[PDB]
Amino acid sequence: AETVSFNFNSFSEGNPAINFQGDVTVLSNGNIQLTNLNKVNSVGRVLYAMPVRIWSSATGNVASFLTSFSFEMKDIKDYDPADGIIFFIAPEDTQIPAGSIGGGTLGVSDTKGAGHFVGVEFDTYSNSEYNDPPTDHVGIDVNSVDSVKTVPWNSVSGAVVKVTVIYDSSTKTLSVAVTNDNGDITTIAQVVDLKAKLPERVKFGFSASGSLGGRQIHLIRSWSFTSTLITT
Amino acid sequence: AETVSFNFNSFSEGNPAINFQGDVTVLSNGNIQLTNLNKVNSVGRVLYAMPVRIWSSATGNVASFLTSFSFEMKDIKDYDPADGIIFFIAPEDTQIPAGSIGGGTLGVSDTKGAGHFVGVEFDTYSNSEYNDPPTDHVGIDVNSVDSVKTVPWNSVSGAVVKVTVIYDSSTKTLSVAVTNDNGDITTIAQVVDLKAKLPERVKFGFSASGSLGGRQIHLIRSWSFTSTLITT
Amino acid sequence: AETVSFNFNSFSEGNPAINFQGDVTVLSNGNIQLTNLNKVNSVGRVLYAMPVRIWSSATGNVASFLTSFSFEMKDIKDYDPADGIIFFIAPEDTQIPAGSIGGGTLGVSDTKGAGHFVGVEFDTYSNSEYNDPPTDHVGIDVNSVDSVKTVPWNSVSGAVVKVTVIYDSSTKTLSVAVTNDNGDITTIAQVVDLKAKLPERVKFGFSASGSLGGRQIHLIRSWSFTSTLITT
Amino acid sequence: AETVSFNFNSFSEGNPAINFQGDVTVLSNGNIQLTNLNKVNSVGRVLYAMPVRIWSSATGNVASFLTSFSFEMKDIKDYDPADGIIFFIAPEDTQIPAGSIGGGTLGVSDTKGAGHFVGVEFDTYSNSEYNDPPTDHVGIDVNSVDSVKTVPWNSVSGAVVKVTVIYDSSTKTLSVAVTNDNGDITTIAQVVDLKAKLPERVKFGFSASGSLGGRQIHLIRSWSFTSTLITT
Ligand SMILES: OC[C@H]1O[C@@H](O[C@H]2[C@H](O)[C@@H](O)[C@@H](O)O[C@@H]2CO)[C@H](O)[C@@H](O)[C@H]1O
Ligand SMILES: OC[C@H]1O[C@@H](O[C@H]2[C@H](O)[C@@H](O)[C@@H](O)O[C@@H]2CO)[C@H](O)[C@@H](O)[C@H]1O
Ligand SMILES: OC[C@H]1O[C@@H](O[C@H]2[C@H](O)[C@@H](O)[C@@H](O)O[C@@H]2CO)[C@H](O)[C@@H](O)[C@H]1O
Ligand SMILES: OC[C@H]1O[C@@H](O[C@H]2[C@H](O)[C@@H](O)[C@@H](O)O[C@@H]2CO)[C@H](O)[C@@H](O)[C@H]1O
Ligand SMILES: [Ca+2]
Ligand SMILES: [Ca+2]
Ligand SMILES: [Ca+2]
Ligand SMILES: [Ca+2]
Ligand SMILES: [Mn+2]
Ligand SMILES: [Mn+2]
Ligand SMILES: [Mn+2]
Numbered sequence: 010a011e012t013v014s015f016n017f018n019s020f021s022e023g024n025p026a027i028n029f030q031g032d033v034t035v036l037s038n039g040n041i042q043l044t045n046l047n048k049v050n051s052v053g054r055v056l057y058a059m060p061v062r063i064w065s066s067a068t069g070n071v072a073s074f075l076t077s078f079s080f081e082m083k084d085i086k087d088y089d090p091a092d093g094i095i096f097f098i099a100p101e102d103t104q105i106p107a108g109s110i111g112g113g114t115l116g117v118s119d120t121k122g123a124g125h126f127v128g129v130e131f132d133t134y135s136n137s138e139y140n141d142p143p144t145d146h147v148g149i150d151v152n153s154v155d156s157v158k159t160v161p162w163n164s165v166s167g168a169v170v171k172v173t174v175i176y177d178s179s180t181k182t183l184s185v186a187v188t189n190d191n192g193d194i195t196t197i198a199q200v201v202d203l204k205a206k207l208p209e210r211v212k213f214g215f216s217a218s219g220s221l222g223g224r225q226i227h228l229i230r231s232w233s234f235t236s237t238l239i240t241t
Numbered sequence: 242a243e244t245v246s247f248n249f250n251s252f253s254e255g256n257p258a259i260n261f262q263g264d265v266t267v268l269s270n271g272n273i274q275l276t277n278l279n280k281v282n283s284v285g286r287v288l289y290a291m292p293v294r295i296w297s298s299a300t301g302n303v304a305s306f307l308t309s310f311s312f313e314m315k316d317i318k319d320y321d322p323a324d325g326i327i328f329f330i331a332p333e334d335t336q337i338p339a340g341s342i343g344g345g346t347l348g349v350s351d352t353k354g355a356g357h358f359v360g361v362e363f364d365t366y367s368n369s370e371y372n373d374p375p376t377d378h379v380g381i382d383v384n385s386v387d388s389v390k391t392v393p394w395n396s397v398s399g400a401v402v403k404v405t406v407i408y409d410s411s412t413k414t415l416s417v418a419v420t421n422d423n424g425d426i427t428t429i430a431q432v433v434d435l436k437a438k439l440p441e442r443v444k445f446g447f448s449a450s451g452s453l454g455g456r457q458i459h460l461i462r463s464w465s466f467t468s469t470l471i472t473t
Numbered sequence: 474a475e476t477v478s479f480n481f482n483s484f485s486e487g488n489p490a491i492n493f494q495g496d497v498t499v500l501s502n503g504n505i506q507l508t509n510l511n512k513v514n515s516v517g518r519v520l521y522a523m524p525v526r527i528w529s530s531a532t533g534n535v536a537s538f539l540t541s542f543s544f545e546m547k548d549i550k551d552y553d554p555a556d557g558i559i560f561f562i563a564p565e566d567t568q569i570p571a572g573s574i575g576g577g578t579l580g581v582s583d584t585k586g587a588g589h590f591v592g593v594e595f596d597t598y599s600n601s602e603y604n605d606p607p608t609d610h611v612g613i614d615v616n617s618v619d620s621v622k623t624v625p626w627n628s629v630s631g632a633v634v635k636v637t638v639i640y641d642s643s644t645k646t647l648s649v650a651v652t653n654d655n656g657d658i659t660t661i662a663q664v665v666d667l668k669a670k671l672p673e674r675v676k677f678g679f680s681a682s683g684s685l686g687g688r689q690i691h692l693i694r695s696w697s698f699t700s701t702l703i704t705t
Numbered sequence: 706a707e708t709v710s711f712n713f714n715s716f717s718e719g720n721p722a723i724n725f726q727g728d729v730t731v732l733s734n735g736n737i738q739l740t741n742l743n744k745v746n747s748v749g750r751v752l753y754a755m756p757v758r759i760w761s762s763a764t765g766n767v768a769s770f771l772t773s774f775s776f777e778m779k780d781i782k783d784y785d786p787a788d789g790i791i792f793f794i795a796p797e798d799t800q801i802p803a804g805s806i807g808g809g810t811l812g813v814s815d816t817k818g819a820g821h822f823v824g825v826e827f828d829t830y831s832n833s834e835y836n837d838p839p840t841d842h843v844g845i846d847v848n849s850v851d852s853v854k855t856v857p858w859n860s861v862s863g864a865v866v867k868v869t870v871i872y873d874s875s876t877k878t879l880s881v882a883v884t885n886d887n888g889d890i891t892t893i894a895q896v897v898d899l900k901a902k903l904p905e906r907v908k909f910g911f912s913a914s915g916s917l918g919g920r921q922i923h924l925i926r927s928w929s930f931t932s933t934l935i936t937t
């Protein structure tokens with residue numbers, strides 16, 4: 010089988026294994042801070058530098074993957090705690106949308122909320138322009154921040170959240186488990202055909218953004234990943 | 242929300258939080274050995290002592306859960322390495338089937354392979370009477386060891402195996418990610434309506450068995466679990 | 474290490490992790506009300522359903538534990554309030570004393586004020602028959618409501634009180650910190666050898682009671698707990 | 706009663722309510738990083754600016770206090786993870802010792818390991834010169850880093866640790882409860898007469914240090930405190 014795996018317990022600029030885009034910054038504690046609290050419509054994204062082959066045009070096989078990461082969002086006096094973080098998968102040449110307004114676009118979509126990507130968002134502000142639920146929520150996005158499906162969630166300021174994601178190639182099911190600070194878990198799952206939505210080689214990463222009045226701390230603390238593609 | 246969670250990095254006799262059934266034994270290193278290498282048709286089961294309410298007849302809500310565990314199977318001279326381990330969910334009154342022949346029933350079913358339980362098996366012997374695939378395999382079992390679905394797998398003697406399971410109540414999807422000793426992952430997912438197959442209160446646990454000629458070391462090394470039921 | 478931990482931010486009827494005894498009722502807001510305002514000598518107790526092994530006869534080790542909880546007592550028109558709440562530890566088979574007169578026995582002792590339990594009381598009425606101090610008080614009880622030690626305190630009707638308790642196994646010290654609504658803290662500590670006063674397996678819970686003329690609202694709002702026993 | 710209480714969920718440079726000493730720095734995420742990873746024998750300390758009156762010379766009374774805080778330590782490539790963090794109480798005019806060598810002195814003592822303070826240390830390196838236990842440990846320090854008492858502990862890189870401390874004036878008992886990342890708790894308690902060891906007014910704070918080859922990330926994430934002195 011074709012397996013790719015990595016595990017970061019701390020990050021650092023200068024590490025060739027990671028690409029940085031936008032206002033991203035690496036704190037002295039190894040944490041990744043995606044947005045710049047002093048910029049309007051800030052957008053920051055981080056990606057595993059090496060593209061991963063999720064499916065094969067030769068065999069038609071699609072990869073299965075297991076990934077978990079931990080992040081932290083915290084309020085700052087005195088802006089609206091927004092907009093959130095999104096774990097995404099996109100073409101290997103993915104870039105921050107030209108003329109990105111950040112905000113509710115989470116740094117992956119245009120003003121209409123469209124883009125080429127599949128992801129799991131941890132959304133902390135309700136943008137009616139993208140049909141968001143009225144509360145904080147976790148959502149599965151397929152080429153749009155107008156989530157295909159969402160589940161109520163609660164973003165606790167300063168709390169460390171743990172996430173586990175499993176993609177089963179056979180059933181094409183993407184299931185997500187979010188462990189909150191207080192111990193409660195939140196789950197959401199959706200059938201998503203990566204073969205039909207994305208190219209053979211993609212990049213995995215995290216993105217976050219803010220607006221003029223919407224800003225908050227977006228930190229990525231750790232990230233382990235393993236994908237296995239059966240080549241037969 | 243109604244949440245139940247626990248974490249076992251090791252086990253010790255006398256812990257009220259755990260229920261032992263059959264030939265279970267706790268080793269000095271804190272590991273749990275499920276079968277007795279000197280008994281014919283040995284069967285051993287360990288269960289979380291407290292019943293978990295996976296669904297409420299009052300609301301109709303079903304709980305989501307996240308659990309991870311690690312186990313190890315090791316060959317012994319001069320017996321056949323069998324039969325395997327099964328992580329299962331069963332009614333709270335669950336007991337080792339009367340007159341259990343162990344072996345391919347994995348300690349959860351009758352001679353015909355039927356029983357009242359839902360589980361994930363790590364099967365190391367191919368029983369044609371229960372329509373097993375021709376190789377080692379992971380399977381999703383619903384009231385029978387004749388798996389609803391299986392995926393090829395390989396049990397490596399002495400290898401520590403890590404497993405992660407997510408059950409999403411909304412989609413009723415049970416997804417499993419198995420991390421093999423060599424780094425590759427194996428996944429299998431299946432939609433299973435726990436509310437339709439099981440009572441409101443159930444017990445979670447592990448079971449293993451052997452026959453006269455089939456015996457091996459079945460070890461459970463760790464187990465973390467969290468289920469959250471929405472009460473509203 | 475053998476660890477038991479749970480966290481209740483709210484309570485619900487039907488949760489198998491909780492045992493109800495006497496006049497206990499679960500309010501729609503998730504709060505637990507211990508006594509019945511319309512009954513003479515009302516007694517209500519709630520216990521964590523699973524017995525906890527606080528010490529091992531094998532090693533002689535005693536567990537350390539950390540627990541915090543919040544409660545509220547509110548006066549009603551026009552009864553005396555009367556009698557209070559007690560956080561207790563007792564044999565796993567503990568039940569409301571037969572023929573309990575409620576009142577100053579706090580639902581845990583007999584008429585003489587004796588019983589089998591260790592606890593921290595938040596006493597709002599002065600029973601001279603149990604040598605109570607003349608004012609509201611917090612006390613450490615060991616097999617009797619005639620406290621081994623008490624400290625002055627003030628029960629404010631309708632005020633949410635937060636409590637933190639630490640039991641250090643090495644020194645066998647039980648320390649309590651009570652945070653009043655006005656920000657002021659009250660502390661009390663006492664050396665109590667749980668190994669000598671209680672059986673290996675015990676249950677933790679809260680009890681409240683009243684009399685014909687003494688009645689008030691006794692509410693448990695939240696409860697988190699963690700006990701760790703060194704096994705080696 | 707005289708009560709002092711504050712709560713910090715994040716810190717900021719410029720907040721007059723805090724004294725910054727040495728290499729301390731505040732990250733853009735609100736965390737306080739005590740030591741500088743690029744300096745030899747780095748020492749950084751943070752103190753609550755307002756001195757607290759822990760005892761009255763007029764009444765002989767000592768104050769009781771309840772404090773809880775969370776911190777994080779993380780290894781860096783490639784130095785020994787040292788030396789640790791200490792929560793301390795010292796004279797109001799306390800400053801980092803002149804010519805401090807950092808390292809095992811934890812920033813509060815001279816080369817002999819002596820100083821004027823009382824504290825709880827989270828020690829991650831074993832200094833034989835100060836009679837340290839052979840493993841990571843939590844210790845109670847009274848005017849010396851040669852702990853009056855210690856308990857085995859385990860510092861996990863990148864894990865958030867929660868600590869609760871209660872000081873009971875009557876019994877003069879200082880009890881500590883440490884909640885590790887995996888849920889396990891570690892406790893330690895010791896009778897310490899604050900009035901005989903410290904002056905009437907003191908400052909509370911944190912300190913950390915490193916050596917030439919011993920360095921790690923020492924972060925303070927949050928801190929809540931309440932002290933009550935009975936004046937009568
Ligand atoms: O409050 C946070 C949200 O702000 C929205 O944009 C605001 C903007 O921040 C404010 O300066 C002004 O221009 O009004 C806008 C409309 O609400 C973002 O669109 C949203 O994503 C949040 O960040
Ligand atoms: O070889 C392992 C398998 O044994 C099967 O049972 C055997 C038994 O071990 C042998 O002594 C003889 O009685 O024939 C039996 C039938 O084949 C089990 O049924 C199977 O589960 C494996 O354990
Ligand atoms: O005033 C509250 C206290 O009442 C005591 O019991 C009273 C009882 O309420 C009254 O009706 C009469 O019978 O005299 C009793 C003895 O004083 C309780 O003993 C005490 O615990 C409080 O509840
Ligand atoms: O390895 C961490 C410990 O270092 C000790 O100091 C070392 C120093 O790091 C090294 O460069 C050389 O000078 O030898 C010293 C003595 O062994 C500290 O004393 C100790 O506290 C740890 O930080
Ligand atoms: Ca949004
Ligand atoms: Ca089989
Ligand atoms: Ca009383
Ligand atoms: Ca040291
Ligand atoms: Mn959204
Ligand atoms: Mn099978
Ligand atoms: Mn009393």
Ligand SMILES: [Mn+2]
Binds near residue numbers: 828842
């Ligand atoms: Mn030390």
